[PDB]
Every structure is written in structure tokens, then in C-alpha cells.
Amino acid sequence: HWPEWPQHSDRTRRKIEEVFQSNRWAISGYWTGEESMERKFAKAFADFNGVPYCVPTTSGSTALMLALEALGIGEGDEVIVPSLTWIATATAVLNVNALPVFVDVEADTYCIDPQLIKSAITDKTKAIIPVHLFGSMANMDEINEIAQEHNLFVIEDCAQSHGSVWNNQRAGTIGDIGAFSCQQGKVLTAGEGGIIVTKNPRLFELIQQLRADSRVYCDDSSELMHGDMQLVKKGDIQGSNYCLSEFQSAILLDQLQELDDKNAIREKNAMFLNDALSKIDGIKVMKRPPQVSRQTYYGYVFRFDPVKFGGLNADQFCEILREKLNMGTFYLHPPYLPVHKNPLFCPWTKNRYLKSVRKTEAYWRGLHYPVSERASGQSIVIHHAILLAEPSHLSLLVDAVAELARKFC
Amino acid sequence: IPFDHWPEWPQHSDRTRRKIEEVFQSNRWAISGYWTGEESMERKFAKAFADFNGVPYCVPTTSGSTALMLALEALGIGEGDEVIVPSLTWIATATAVLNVNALPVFVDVEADTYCIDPQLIKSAITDKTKAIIPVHLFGSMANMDEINEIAQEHNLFVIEDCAQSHGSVWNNQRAGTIGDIGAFSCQQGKVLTAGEGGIIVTKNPRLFELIQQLRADSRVYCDDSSELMHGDMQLVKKGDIQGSNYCLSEFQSAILLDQLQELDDKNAIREKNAMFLNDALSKIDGIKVMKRPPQVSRQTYYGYVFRFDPVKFGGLNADQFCEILREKLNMGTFYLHPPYLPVHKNPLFCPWTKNRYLKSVRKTEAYWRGLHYPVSERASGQSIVIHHAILLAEPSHLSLLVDAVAELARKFC
Ligand SMILES: Cc1ncc(COP(=O)(O)O)c(CN[C@@H]2C[C@H](N)[C@@H](O)[C@H](O)[C@H]2O)c1O
Ligand SMILES: Cc1ncc(COP(=O)(O)O)c(C=O)c1O
Ligand SMILES: [Cl-]
């Protein structure tokens, strides 16, 4: 059968056990003798990425929101985001009362096309959110150059690329702030979870306050007594409670340990598949940027020519492969419809949002981003747990697609 | 039982461990994970909480604060709206309102319940007002008879903030079931906790579906829960309303299911002890316990509150009173402390510092800091809150607190 995801061991279980033995289940819970799982996780992930500051939080969505809040973003601002991504990239912007402004993606990476960014920049633009989508990385060299020239911040959405390396720098480390999801499907997971990283110490403080009802850590854990609060008032910036449970921080500490190993396994299997699948006619694989030395695969993506597969759309191509391979819709599916065409994206439906950002239904749906729209219609996405199988088991994917090619010659 | 130590919080057992194991056995850690043959912990917990509360619909979420925020969104509250809240509460009650681009409007609390004073609500009502958020604070309930009458007369919604009152009963209805939507926190210090978490409940079927969508990126569960395969998504697109991800992890939903098992009985222990304290403490001259309305047949005590007259206690404030008591009982600060400052005076409340909030609602430091609610203001200076863990001790342990308070009265007689 196909690999399950997530994967736990007894180390997972021990880490939970430590939480129960601590009797501290939240960071807003008082000190009970030793450091919290949150801070231990924050340190370990920050060292994993060679970045100095990390603040855990509740989700990838909330991580983006906090990041935007920390950069002073608000009413009247525009934030540039890719047309092809999971809707959270966009709705995070809406959630801080800014307008997301879409830009199409490159055909070979499905990451935001730096050559189209300039043309979307306006007086209101304050930031860009590139997404390291599926199993690639947005072009951070070009994107940082554009941002530096137009005075814009850069928030990396690393939800699908935990541990990717671009010119010796881990994903999330290269813009001003890096945002991560630890939702079940992701390569680093506790069911739900969020992470922020940054090199900037001012941002570190503001992000703590944003996620802890305006509080920061105390100056020195080492002088806390049993019963004392570790979180203390600051009030430089208003926050709400987006604190990660100690149970989740503990599982992340466990899961982190096997991250680089499992990423290399995935990456090598992506390679196998590129080699295999590219030999089939009318199957295109993604192009790896030179700058990337280590690529994390959350989803492995290839493209098909509908002219050589009997006019199949990817919904149908995927329904066939799922029946032929005996794997479900979590494991195999087309990319997200681009955000403006995605029924889950519907800001006009809620009053919270400003009149000026919710536009109308026709407004948003009538937008056009042809690379993104094509990609959704003629690409197949394989969930990364499949990149943890035996290469002999992967050859079943290759043959299933070789059989489909053969049939529709 | 002789005294050895004050009870601590939280409290687990091996049933808690087994609930975590079941999550591992399931191989489903998020409600956004693939179907593995049985319903989520989320759903199991929702159904359990629904039954406990006598309420048709239940949707877990991530925190009390998000529960409040999502309840507001689900009632269509947004820019240009006002929402009435009490001055005396935790700041999340107000900041959840600012989060949806509405203006929180403070009303003072009643002297002998510290819950929103219904007689002051009419005066704060304007054309912008769309809802009231009563808080069932510490170990009282807001007056839902009066609040619902005012709400009906003025076409306002009512969201009950139940974070400090899980299981309280007003005229044979559980707290959270009486207004349009109930919101709950399951943060560590609460009586029902998984360290973090939240709950939303409603009677209204349309609100149930909206709330589902508001917490799972505009998704609901697929219709036929048992006509999908292992490895399939169970959340399907719906898109009636724009949502975000405010899904509770299966590990937390699992913990809550275990904890909920014991909730009613641990609440009864607390309440039996609160009554004993009210008996004992009300006999000390200068001490005033809170008044419990006859509509309340079960009161959940997140905190036991009593008041003191500084005139009869040497001019001490609450902070000093608490410090003495903690010294003499060897009790920690988490368990015995004055109540909250009023929200408008709380330093953690500083919405003007945040550009994300609309200029029109964040206003200025001068605006918020310069408000005045006397009853609520005096609360922190002359009240003592006992965290509910201490109420799981034996009655003879609690008598030690009574004697400490009585001794201190004697000194100043
Ligand atoms: C680029 C990007 N940015 C932000 C996010 C949001 O993070 P979370 O709030 O942790 O979900 C995601 C997660 N996206 C996933 C996508 C998946 N199809 C869905 O079923 C799942 O619930 C969600 O976690 C992402 O992929
Ligand atoms: C009355 C009240 N409302 C809302 C909240 C917010 O709950 P959470 O901390 O889980 O966001 C709390 C938490 O302390 C609370 O006491
Ligand atoms: Cl989608």
C-alpha cells in the first residue's frame, strides 16, 4: 500500500508525555520548572534554518496575518500575491484590511513571475508574498531586487517548502519575514500549527505581542520560579491569542528531527520521477532553479498535453489515475484552481471586509491569469508521502501514465 | 483528608493519554486530513459538547477569542457596526469586535455580580448597534432574561461569552444556548481545557453551516460521511461565506473529549465548595460575596469572587489583601489575585498601536483610556478571585482561607 501521513514513533509519544509530566499545556500557563515546548521548538527550528528569531503560532494562515500586521499593513495597502496558490495566501491579506493584487506565475515553476510584478506595483503596494509552491521556490534574487527598488517588504510563504535552500539560505530566511503551516498534509506537522521566522529583532518582539494579547517573554526564564508567569506585558502592539498548544509544539520538536532525512528521500524520489516521466511524450516536468541546492516537496507536480491524452482535463486525468493507483483525493489531485476562480475565495460574502476590498463576485471571477488557469487544468499533483515509497512502488505511477499515453497516441 | 498542598491545574489521567493514542491510531491529526474510516475527534467532541449543552449545533475552533470573532462574522457584523460589551472582562471580549472592523462599546457591570448591567445597555444603544456580548464572568451569569428582552426590543443579536462558565444553567438552559451564539475558550486555566481551544454553539441551522465555513476556508463536511474512501478529503467546497483556517487539532479535540467526561462532576465539586465559602465568608463583617440570581440552578466557577470593604480592612487594596493571604496560606499568584482592570484601562488593550485596525475604530489612546465605568474600576481594587482549582480542595482546606480572612478582619476591628 501507499505511505500514511503523518508518521509518528515512540519519540512522538515521549514528547507528549513530557507535556503531561510538566503540567503546563499553554505558554500562557505558568512556569513549572523547565522551559516550555514552545521555546524549545522555537530554538530548534530557528537553528534548523540558521535564522535568529522564531515565533510559533496556530496555523500557516495566522502566520501570514501576524507577519502582515507586524509590517504595519492595513487599510488602503496592496499586497502582491501569486494567482496560483492556496487561498490562505490571499485571504491573509484581506484579513488585515489590505487588497491582494494577483500576479501570474512562471510556466516552469508555478511560482510568482518576477517579470509581471513590476507592472502590478502601485502607490498602495507595500509588500509581496511569494509562495514556494509545491516543490519549487520563487525567484528570491529577482524578487528581492524588485522589493528593494520599490520599498516593499517580502513575506515568504513557506507552507509547502520547509527546509528548502536557495543560495545557501533556508526558505523563509531570505525575505523580511518567513511564514509556515504545520497542517497535517505538510512536511512538518502537528495536525495544525504555524511558524514565523525573521532575522529582524524588532519584528521578533512585535510578532510575540501579536500572537499573545500584547505580551512578550520575560527577560530571563532562568530566574522564574514555579508558579510565575513567563509571558509579561508589553503593549507596544496590540495582539490576540494565537498561541500554539504545548502538545503541538512538542510534536513539532519530534517531527523536526527527521525533517532533513525525509526531505532528501522525497527529493531523490522526485528525481527518479522526473527521469521516468519526462521520457513519456506530452509530459512536462517542472524546472529546478540553479539557486536551489535542497528542494522540499510537499507536492510533486507534472504536466500533461491534453492533445496527447484525448482532451482529458486534469480532474479526469486524476480520477483515472486514482482508480488505477488506488489512492484518494488527498494523495492525488490537480493544483488548486487559481485563487480568483476558486469557489473558496468569496470575500464579497462578508461584512467584516471593506467595501473597497470585496469588490463584486464578477470583478474577481472575471480576472484573468492565463498561466495559472492553464496549470490547474493540465497538471497533476502527487502528495509527498508518495515520495516516501519504494522506487519500485513509484514505477507503478510511471507505468499508469505510460499506459495512458500509449492508449491516446 | 489533612491538608498537604493546594490543588493544581490542569489535571489529566490515563484516559487523557488514551485519547491521544486514539488520534495516533486514527492517523488523522486535522479535520483537513484524509478520511481513515471513522469520524474525526472534532466531530466526536462536537457531538459530546452538543449533548452536554443541550444545544443542536456545535463547532470547535482554536481559541475563545476566535470563537467570539467567528460568531460575530457569522451574524454579518462588520464595518460601521457597534457591539456592546462589559467593561470588566478579559480584553479578548473587546478585541474580537475590533477584529471584525466593528467598534466595541463598553457598558458598566453590576456591583454584586460583575456582569453587564442590563439597566445600562439601553443608553449605549445607537443606530450602529447590532449585538451585545454578555460575559458570564468568574462565577456569575449575566442576566439573560433582561438582556434577551432588550435584544428583542432593539433587534440586536446576543453572543454569550462563556469562557468562564462552561456548564452553568440559567432557567434550565446551559450557558451559551440562550443567545444567538455561545462562545467558549478552552485555554489552560479554564475548567474545560486542552491548553488551547475554542468552541462555538448555536441553535440555528444556517449559522451552524456558516460557522463551519468560517473556520475551514469556506468548507463544510461532505454530505455522506460514509460514502468516501480511505485517503479522501472529507472537507468539501461550499463558499456561501468566506472563511479562514480556524480548525482545532485532533489532539486537542481528543483531550477535550476526555476532559468533558469529568466536567459536570468537577463543576459540582467547585459549586458545593463555593456555596460553603459564601456561607462562611458572608459572616465576616466587611466581606460581601456575590449575589446569585434564582434563575441560576448550576453555577460554574472559573473564579470564586468575594468583595471587601477597605474601610474595615485597614485601607488595604486587593493587591495587598491578596499578597497577605498568599503568604499565610502559601498559595500561588495564579490561584489568588484581584480581578482584571477594566478593559479600557488594561495595558494589553492598545488598539491604536495597530495599523491593521481601522482608524475609525482604533481611535486614540486618549479616547479609550479616558472612558469611565466606576463599578468596573473599583472591582480590581477591592475584590479577591480564587481560581477554581482551589475549589477542588476539601471544605476543611478552604476553611483555612476563611480563617485567614477572619483573622485579618479581627486585626482591623
Ligand atoms: C501556500 C500556503 N499558504 C498558507 C497555507 C495556510 O496554512 P494553514 O492555515 O496551516 O492551513 C497553506 C496551507 N494550505 C493547505 C492546502 C490544503 N489543500 C488544505 O486542505 C489544507 O487545509 C491547507 O492546510 C498553503 O499551502
Ligand atoms: C471572558 C473571556 N473571553 C475570551 C477569552 C479568550 O479565550 P482564549 O484565551 O482561549 O482566546 C478568555 C481567555 O482568557 C476569557 O477569559
Ligand atoms: Cl482548492
UniProtKB/Swiss-Prot annotation, chain B:
What keywords tag this UniProt record? Aminotransferase, Antibiotic biosynthesis, Pyridoxal phosphate, Transferase
Q: What cofactor is needed?
A: pyridoxal 5'-phosphate
- Molecular function GO labels: pyridoxal phosphate binding; transaminase activity
First-tier enzyme category under EC: transferase
Enzyme Commission number(s) of this protein: 2.6.1.100, 2.6.1.101
Q: Which residues carry this modification: N6-(pyridoxal phosphate)lysine?
A: 190
UniProt pathway: Metabolic intermediate biosynthesis; 2-deoxystreptamine biosynthesis; 2-deoxystreptamine from D-glucose 6-phosphate: step 2/4; Metabolic intermediate biosynthesis; 2-deoxystreptamine biosynthesis; 2-deoxystreptamine from D-glucose 6-phosphate: step 4/4; Antibiotic biosynthesis; butirosin biosynthesis
Query: Does this entry carry the keyword Metal-binding?
Result: no
Q: Which reaction does it catalyse?
A: 2-deoxy-L-scyllo-inosose + L-glutamine = 2-deoxy-scyllo-inosamine + 2-oxoglutaramate; 3-amino-2,3-dideoxy-scyllo-inosose + L-glutamine = 2-deoxystreptamine + 2-oxoglutaramate
A GO biological process this protein is involved in? polysaccharide biosynthetic process
Q: What is the role of the protein in this entry?
A: Catalyzes the PLP-dependent transamination of 2-deoxy-scyllo-inosose (2-DOI) to form 2-deoxy-scyllo-inosamine (2-DOIA) using L-glutamine as the amino donor. Also catalyzes the transamination of 3-amino-2,3-dideoxy-scyllo-inosose (keto-2-DOIA) into 2-deoxystreptamine (2-DOS).
Protein name in UniProt: L-glutamine:2-deoxy-scyllo-inosose aminotransferase
Q: Which gene encodes it?
A: btrR
